[PDB]
Structures are given as structure tokens and as C-alpha cells.
Design a protein around this nucleic acid. Structure first.
Ligand SMILES: [Cl-]
Ligand SMILES: [Cl-]
Ligand SMILES: [Mg+2]
Ligand SMILES: [Mg+2]
Ligand SMILES: [Mg+2]
Ligand SMILES: [Mg+2]
Ligand SMILES: [Mg+2]
Ligand SMILES: [Mg+2]
Ligand SMILES: [Mg+2]
Ligand SMILES: [Mg+2]
Ligand SMILES: [Mg+2]
Ligand code: NA
Ligand code: NA
Ligand code: NA
Ligand code: NA
Ligand code: NA
Ligand code: NA
Lengths: 154, 186, 95, 156, 140
RNA sequence: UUAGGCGGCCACAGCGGUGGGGUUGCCUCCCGUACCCAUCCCGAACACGGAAGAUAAGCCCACCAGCGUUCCGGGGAGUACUGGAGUGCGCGAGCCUCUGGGAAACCCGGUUCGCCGCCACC
RNA sequence: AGUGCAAGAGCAAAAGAUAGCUUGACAGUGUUCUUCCCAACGAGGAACGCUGACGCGAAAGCGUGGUCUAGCGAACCAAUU
RNA sequence: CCUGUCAAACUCCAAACUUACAGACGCCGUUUGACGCGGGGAUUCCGGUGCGCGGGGUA
């Protein structure tokens, strides 16, 4: 399970690429989704590779973000442990996070919006003109790599 | 053989055994084929159907297993052919086969030929086959009359020991007669 | 194109590789299909008749009745529904 | 006319003589020079390596070749060495000599397409590299920058 | 092994390659059976432009008709060697050709399952000279 | 399948070459032209009638890789080329990096001297 | 190689050659594709059927002209069945 | 035998890629009726630029 974060806008990006991000529930810059590592999902993120940031986040990080940026399928309601417990199969955020990571369920299955609309990265990100291996913020990241980004946009 | 571009004919064309252009016209009818084949000493008659991995033979008759019914004469002649035809025709019927077309392979459509004899026999057995009566032998030759008369010009037995000296087109009737009722494997 | 006949630019798709050259096996020209089957359309360079317009080589349609020995296969050209008159010789079972 | 007009490999390959007529004959005199009776049985083997893919008109091939071999007469008219220009001008070139109307030009020449890093010239010498000099003069008359490379020769 | 390996005469073709005939008659008597026309191919300067056109005849003799003929033909010939085929044949003379081969030749002449004869089972020039020479005459 | 008939795939089956096999049975060569039939001339062939002889052909069986073919290892080669991205480089031609794909020739070593189906059959 | 003619393509117990026989280059009416990719548009073209009448072949079958893709033409008026 | 080179109208080979159909996941539609069908009204048929691939042209 990888965390997907659109870092580049729609203007000028191929339509078949945009449609893919839209198929992955991301319709704005900085919006983030959690995607299982399957052949079918793998092909999709590869096509989206140049306009996004992805990787496998740590239990903790996912937890911080879930708590800070998760939302109900509809409404303002904060998704805190109580919410998770009184609305999901799990007892608390950590419970959910673990399940997500182990790809046992998904944000929809648990009545949650498939998108974690994050905040602009605090301190700024490494650039949308180069990939990670180059000092950029594009492409696959380290678990420690993705964690910093996700955390900075907490 | 020569190079990558060389064209090797189909195996059954190399072996000079199957005429594929005729085969295709044959398969067009969508009916079973009445395979009429010969050998220096024998005559075979098969009813073939089309199959996923090749042809399927649903009924056959060989001039050799003819004696099995009381044949005591040679097996590479006209009377032999007819009978083998009738025998396979009958086994065919038993197999639920009702119609077929005459495949005479690489043989020639010569009038009164054994292949047409085989065709006449299969027909009489009850099989429905598209044919042409006046391309067939005149019954007597089918019986083996041409050979009995040939032995009339005797001086020396036409048959080395075998059976009879003056041969028997009658032995032919006795057998056809036999085949037209009861008996095993029919 | 410089011309607009049906064989325009069909040099490749209507030619056999040197080794598949010459009359084709009769097994496949007699194959029987049932209404509803999915069949791949490909012209046999070696088989003259029963052909369909070269543009449809590659299509995978649905057998829906026949006309004579030839089959009537429904396809969809871009967004248009069409019916193609083709013989077994130029059809293959999908899967 | 200037090399500027034909030195790039931007056009389609045009070489089918069965569809092209009136192609000018090549100005390249020979491809094999020196002792062509003998086979490459020499200690040293230097080569002239083009450093960028380019088109070289038979014009420049001949001037480059002549300037090199004509110089290799620092060894003598029947000296002990063998020189080879391995490329041949296959690429037919036109010129549009009406303005841009019906502009497909008319064959005016031929050039050889050389890819960066191929060797256009190969000489064979005994420890007597006057050839290295025959090439400083050769790449002097061909568009690209070039690399004078020595192969069998650890006799430095 | 032998018996089925020993040579034999298969057809003797006697043909008169004229250039436009009355000659059939003599071929008829010299052999004993009707001659066959010899059409020609290609249009040529020897006022021989006609494609289908009688320009000679031939006669293929088999069995006795062939021996009974060679029993006078051969005597009228001297030659031998070099003038022999690589398959053990030879032509001398009005032409008279003699095709020689061993017992299982039909295998290559029939319709069904036909097959080319193996080089080993072929007849060599030498094995040919022997056979004929051993039948009323001398080689070279 | 101790030798057969009809096939499917249509060279992995082609080309060439070696050894073995028929005492009654099968295929052949083979023997033979009164008949059906036959050669623009020939029972060569085609067709018909038949066993005195043979295992030399064919055919069946076992095997050989020199040529051709099929597939595989290792090398060539993650090379050539390429879908996506770049305020990376270069006067430019063009190149480079990240991401997803990925060859051909050729060399060396294996593989391949057909596989399979139906019927009939000491 | 040949297959009438461009070019590309098809074809070997043939689609080529030879022989013989025959007029299916037949009347009628359609289905489909093409013309016009997608996507509407006429004449024309092709493939594939059926009804009828025929040719050849033992027969399956083949023949809706020539192996395939060029060789074509509206209304009005005339002449013709 | 050896040795030196090529192809838009060459091919013993052969991608990336484009593409028909089917299944899966995704996304979407069944009060926002998708897919599709019928009808009304148009505008439009001077385009341009970057990037990739081009063809012509010294440019
Ligand atoms: Cl037979
Ligand atoms: Cl069509
Ligand atoms: Mg909401
Ligand atoms: Mg700030
Ligand atoms: Mg920045
Ligand atoms: Mg092309
Ligand atoms: Mg033997
Ligand atoms: Mg036609
Ligand atoms: Mg008018
Ligand atoms: Mg008129
Ligand atoms: Mg394309
Ligand atoms: Na074929
Ligand atoms: Na002008
Ligand atoms: Na220079
Ligand atoms: Na004549
Ligand atoms: Na043998
Ligand atoms: Na029309």
C-alpha cells in the first residue's frame, strides 16, 4: 500500500494521465490517496509517475495524517479515534491505519472519503522538475522519504 | 531445406498420399467420407468423419476380414471390393451413419473400377451416397464373371492351388447373401 | 494515399511470410461456428474467396447467422455497427 | 556549394538507384591505397574516427583522402603501409535549382553517412606513424571534429 | 540382394528431330509401332516460329519391342564410354536412346506415395556398361 | 502400429548419410494382359488379373547434426531503439538523467533426424 | 516460369501448361461491405445468398467473366425488349 | 576463400507502441437515468503555437 500525492497541476498534463489520477480519486493538487500494490494499481501509478509523489508510509505517519486529514464520505466530522470506533470495524485510528497498510480494507469501505486533502508542505518540497534520485520530489520515495513529505503536509 | 525462405510442402503432400484440393471439395458436403482404398492384395473401405485433432473413422471393412464370413477366394478383385464395401456399409449403418460421399483418394475415376465397386456395395448396404450408376461395372463383372471366363481360357489354373479351378462368381452370391442378415459384427 | 482502392496499403497484411506460402490447410476453411461465438477476423493471404474489407483485419466480432456457407459476423467499426460476410478460411475462435 | 547545405542527416535515406537517375559519378579515386597486395600484417594500426554523425559529400572524401595519402609519400610511392577509407557515398543529394513550387530538387551529388565514433580511415604502418600526420591533414577537410585513434600499438 | 539389383532396359526412344513428317513411316517399320508427333516450343529464326507444330517424331519401345530393336540397333553403333549418362543411360546414332535402371523404378513413376530413387539404388555409368556389354558386344 | 488406412499441426517433420527387418500373415517391389479401363506411341503410367521370386528401392524400425529449421543457456546487451517526465547539457546537430519497456547480427554450448488423433491389426 | 496491361499481392497433384467439352460473360431478386475509416451522401464496384434455367464432373463440387485491387456516367429526350 | 560498404518505394529478423474483443480492479450510472433512441436550434468548414514523429525546402 502506497501513499499517492499529486504534486503537479492539470494544465498541460495528458488527458489520459489526468483521467487516471481522477480514477484514483485525486482531483486537485496536494490531494492524497492510499493505493494497494496490485498489478492493476501498479500500472496506474507508473503512468502517473511524473506528476505525483508516492511510497509506503509508516504506521505512525499514516496515523498522523489519517487523524489530521481524513474525512467522512460526507460532512465536516473529525475522524478521531472515537469517530473511527463509533463508525468503523476498528477501535481506533491506529487500528484503521494498520488495516489500510496491510490492505485489508479501504477508506471507502469504512465510510471515509477516498481522499486525504493535505496541506501545502511546510518548508516547501524538493521541486516538481526533478525526481527523487535527482533531488526532486517526483516519483517513488523512501518510507522515510514519503513520511517527511506527508508529515510536512500534515 | 535450402534456406529460411524455402517452402516445405505439407507432410501428406510430401508422402504423396493426400490430395488437399480434392479433400477440401470433399469436406464441403459436410457429410461422412466413404474412403475407398486399395493394395496389391487387399481393398479397404472406411467411413470417416471430421475431428478436432484429425479424422475419426466410425466404421470400416477390410477385404481380409472378409473370409471371417466364409471368403475362400483372393481379396484383390472386383467381387472382393464390392463385398468389403457392403460389409463396411453395414457396420456403417449400425454406427448410425446414413449418408456419405465417395473419397477415392489418388485413384482414378475409371468406369467399373474397384473403388466404384466399393461404392456400389456401400450403397446397397443402405448408405445414401451421391453417385452415378453408369460409371459402375455391370453386376456380372462385380460378381467376378470376367475372371471365371478368363479361367475358361484355362490350360493352367488361374488360381495357384487356392480354391476351385474354374473359380466361382457363385461363391460371391453366397457371401453377399450371407451379409444381408444377422451375423456378428454387423 | 495516392489511390483509394480496397487494397491500398495492404502490401503487408495481405502477404504471407515465405514459409506460410502456398495453399492453406482445409481443416480451418471448414471449421463450424455457432451464433454468439467470438471470432478473430484475419484474411488468409493464400485463400482468394470469402474475404472481407482489409480494414477490418484484426477485428473480433460475433457470429450471428450465416449466408450460404459464409458467415455473417457483427463488428463495430469505431462507433458504427457493421455486419461482415466472411468464410471460415478467414476466421479463428477467440480464446 | 557549402557543406552547410548537406552535412546534416535530417532527410530520409535516399539511395534506391532503381528510382533515381542522373546521379553524378563519385570523385573518390581509390579506397585501397598503399600495398594492397599485402594483408593487414602490420604492427601498428591507426584510425580516423569521426566524432559526430554527419553526411560527407564525395567531394570532401576525395580531398580528405588525397591530402592524407598524397602526404603518406613521406614513405614513398611504393612505401610499406596500407590505407583504407571504409565508407562509400550512398546517400544521393539534391538541390532545388518556379520558387517553392514543385521544389523536389534534382540529383547534384552523393554523400556518405557516418555515425559519430565510426572510423572513416584506417591505415596500417610499422613503427613509423607519419600517418598520424596524414590524418591531421585529413580531418582538416571533412566537417566533423575527429579523433586519431591507435589500435594495435603499445609501442609508445 | 541381387536379382532385384541387376539392371534392365526400360524403354528405348527412337526419334528423328527434323525441322518441320514423312519420316514417321520409316520409324514405324524400324520399330514396329506408331510414332508420335514432336511439337516445338518457342519462336525461332529457322522459320520455326510456330509453337504447336509437327517437327519430328519419336517412339518409346518397352520389353521385347525394345530388345528386338536393339538387337540390330546396337550392332549399327560402335561408340561407348563418355557417351554414357551419369544415371547409366546412353544415346547413339536419327537418334536411339536407351534408358536403363533397376527393378524398383515404378516407385518413382506411380501416382500414389511415389518417391525418388535413392542415389545408392541408382544405376552408375559403369554398372551400366557391364550389363549391356554383357549382351552381344564390347564397351569403349 | 513385426511393416497398414484416414488425418491434425504443416521443416522440431527439410536436405544428406549409416545399420536392421519379412519361415504362415501385411505393405511393396514383383509376375502378367481375357476382361472394365488406358497411352495424341508405348499394360511406363492409368486399370484390371494374379503370387514364381525378393527384402535390393519404397516403406517400417534404430541411429548420425555436416547443411536447413525450432526452442533454450551463457555472452553480445539492459547495448540499439523506445511510451512518459525534466528551468539537465550542447552554438547547433544532438546528448543526458529519472520512469516504464526492450531488439537484431554474431560467437560458444545444449535441443531438433517430428509430435499427436481416429480406425484397423499376433 | 506462367497467369492480357501499372504496381503490390495470390497461385504447383494449381489460379500455370496441354487436350477435350462447354457458353455461368445466363434471367430474376436480394443480403452485406465498399464508394464515403470513424460518420450522412448518388452512380459505379465487390463479396455472399436465394429463385429459375443451364455447363462440366463419378461425385463432393466448380461456373454470379478474366486470380485480386483501375477500364467509368444523373435527370430530361431518342431508339430498342 | 579473404576483404570494404548500403536501402522511403529490400527483409532471414524485430521492438517500444497503436489497436479488436473478453475478464478483473478502478471510476461511473440506476431520485444527478448513465449507455442508447427520436426530434428542435445552432455555430462552424481563413486557424495558430509548443513538444514528439514527420515529407519538401540551403534556409
Ligand atoms: Cl488407394
Ligand atoms: Cl466487409
Ligand atoms: Mg465531504
Ligand atoms: Mg515560507
Ligand atoms: Mg522549487
Ligand atoms: Mg508498410
Ligand atoms: Mg534392407
Ligand atoms: Mg474470381
Ligand atoms: Mg440536357
Ligand atoms: Mg437505342
Ligand atoms: Mg501507427
Ligand atoms: Na498457406
Ligand atoms: Na511555374
Ligand atoms: Na573538421
Ligand atoms: Na498432334
Ligand atoms: Na527393402
Ligand atoms: Na452502391
Amino acid at each position: 500500500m502506497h501513499a499517492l500525492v499529486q504534486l503537479r497541476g492539470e494544465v498541460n498534463m495528458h488527458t489520459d494521465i489526468q483521467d487516471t489520477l481522477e480514477m484514483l480519486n485525486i482531483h486537485h493538487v496536494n490531494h492524497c490517496t492510499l493505493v494497494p500494490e496490485t498489478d492493476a494499481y501498479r500500472g496506474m501509478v507508473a503512468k502517473v509517475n511524473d506528476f505525483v509523489a508516492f511510497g509506503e508510509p509508516s504506521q505512525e505517519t499514516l496515523e498522523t495524517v489519517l487523524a489530521t486529514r481524513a474525512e467522512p464520505l460526507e460532512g465536516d466530522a473529525d475522524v478521531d479515534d472515537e469517530w473511527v470506533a463509533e463508525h468503523t470495524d476498528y477501535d481506533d485510528i491506529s487500528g484503521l491505519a494498520f488495516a489500510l497498510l496491510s490492505e485489508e480494507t479501504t477508506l471507502r469501505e469504512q465510510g471515509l472519503s477516498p481522499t486525504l486533502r493535505l496541506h501545502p508542505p511546510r518548508g516547501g518540497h524538493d521541486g516538481v522538475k526533478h525526481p527523487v534520485k535527482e533531488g526532486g520530489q517526483l516519483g517513488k520515495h523512501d518510507t522515510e522519504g514519503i513520511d517527511d513529505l506527508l508529515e510536512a503536509m500534515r | 531445406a535450402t534456406g529460411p525462405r524455402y517452402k516445405v510442402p505439407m507432410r501428406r503432400r510430401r508422402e504423396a498420399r493426400t490430395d488437399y484440393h480434392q479433400r477440401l471439395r470433399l469436406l464441403k458436403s459436410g457429410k461422412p467420407r466413404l474412403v475407398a482404398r486399395k493394395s496389391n492384395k487387399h481393398v479397404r473401405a472406411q467411413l470417416v468423419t471430421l475431428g478436432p485433432n484429425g479424422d475419426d473413422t466410425l466404421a470400416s471393412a477390410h477385404s481380409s476380414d472378409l473370409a471371417e464370413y466364409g471368403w475362400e477366394a483372393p481379396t484383390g478383385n472386383m467381387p472382393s471390393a464390392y463385398l468389403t464395401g457392403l460389409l463396411a456399409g453395414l457396420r456403417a449403418q449400425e454406427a448410425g451413419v446414413e449418408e456419405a460421399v465417395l473419397d477415392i483418394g489418388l485413384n482414378s475415376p475409371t468406369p467399373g473400377s474397384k473403388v466404384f465397386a466399393i461404392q456400389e456395395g456401400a450403397i446397397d448396404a443402405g448408405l445414401d451416397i451421391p453417385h452415378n450408376d453408369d460409371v459402375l461395372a455391370d453386376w456380372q463383372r462385380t460378381r467376378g464373371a470376367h475372371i471365371a471366363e478368363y479361367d475358361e481360357q484355362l490350360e493352367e489354373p488361374l488360381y495357384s492351388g487356392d480354391f476351385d479351378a474354374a473359380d466361382l462368381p457363385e461363391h460371391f452370391d453366397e457371401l453377399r447373401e450371407t451379409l444381408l442378415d444377422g451375423d456378428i459384427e454387423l | 494515399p495516392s489511390s483509394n482502392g480496397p487494397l491500398e496499403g495492404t502490401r503487408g497484411k495481405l502477404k504471407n511470410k515465405p514459409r506460410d506460402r502456398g495453399t492453406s490447410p482445409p481443416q480451418r476453411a471448414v471449421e463450424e461456428f455457432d451464433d454468439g461465438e467470438k471470432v478473430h477476423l484475419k484474411i488468409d493471404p493464400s485463400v482468394p474467396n470469402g474475404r472481407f474489407h482489409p480494414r477490418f483485419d484484426g477485428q473480433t466480432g460475433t457470429v450471428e447467422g450465416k449466408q450460404g456457407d459464409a458467415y455473417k459476423v457483427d463488428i463495430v467499426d469505431g462507433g458504427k455497427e457493421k455486419t461482415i460476410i466472411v468464410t471460415a478460411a478467414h476466421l479463428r475462435r477467440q480464446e | 556549394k557549402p557543406g552547410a547545405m548537406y552535412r546534416n542527416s535530417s532527410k530520409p535515406a535516399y539511395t534506391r538507384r532503381e528510382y533515381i537517375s542522373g546521379i553524378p559519378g563519385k570523385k573518390i579515386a581509390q579506397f585501397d591505397m598503399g600495398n594492397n597486395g599485402a594483408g593487414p600484417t602490420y604492427p601498428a594500426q591507426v584510425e580516423l574516427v569521426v566524432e559526430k554523425p554527419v553526411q560527407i559529400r564525395h567531394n570532401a572524401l576525395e580531398a580528405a583522402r588525397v591530402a592524407a595519402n598524397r602526404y603518406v609519400q613521406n614513405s614513398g610511392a611504393a612505401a610499406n603501409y596500407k590505407f583504407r577509407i571504409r565508407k562509400f557515398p550512398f546517400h544521393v543529394i539534391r538541390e532545388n535549382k518556379d520558387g517553392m513550387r514543385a521544389p523536389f530538387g534534382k540529383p547534384v551529388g552523393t554523400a556518405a553517412r557516418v555515425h559519430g565514433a565510426n572510423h572513416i580511415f584506417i591505415a596500417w604502418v610499422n613503427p613509423d606513424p607519419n600517418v598520424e600526420e596524414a590524418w591531421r591533414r585529413a580531418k582538416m577537410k571533412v566537417t566533423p571534429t575527429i579523433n586519431i585513434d591507435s589500435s594495435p600499438a603499445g609501442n609508445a | 540382394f541381387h536379382e532385384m539389383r541387376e539392371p534392365r532396359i526400360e524403354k528405348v526412344v527412337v526419334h528423328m528431330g527434323i525441322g518441320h513428317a514423312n519420316a514417321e513411316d520409316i520409324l514405324g517399320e524400324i520399330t514396329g509401332q506408331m510414332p508420335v508427333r514432336t511439337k516445338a516450343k518457342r519462336t525461332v529464326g529457322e522459320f520455326d516460329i510456330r509453337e504447336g507444330d509437327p517437327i519430328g517424331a519419336k517412339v518409346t519401345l518397352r520389353d521385347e519391342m525394345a530388345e528386338e530393336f536393339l538387337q540390330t540397333a546396337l550392332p549399327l553403333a560402335e561408340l561407348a564410354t563418355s557417351q554414357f549418362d551419369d544415371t547409366g543411360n546412353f544415346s547413339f546414332g536419327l537418334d536411339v536412346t536407351v534408358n536403363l535402371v533397376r527393378p524398383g523404378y515404378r516407385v518413382a513413376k506411380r501416382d500414389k506415395a511415389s518417391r525418388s530413387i535413392p542415389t545408392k539404388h541408382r544405376l552408375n555409368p559403369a554398372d551400366a556398361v557391364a550389363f549391356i556389354e554383357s549382351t552381344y558386344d564390347v564397351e569403349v
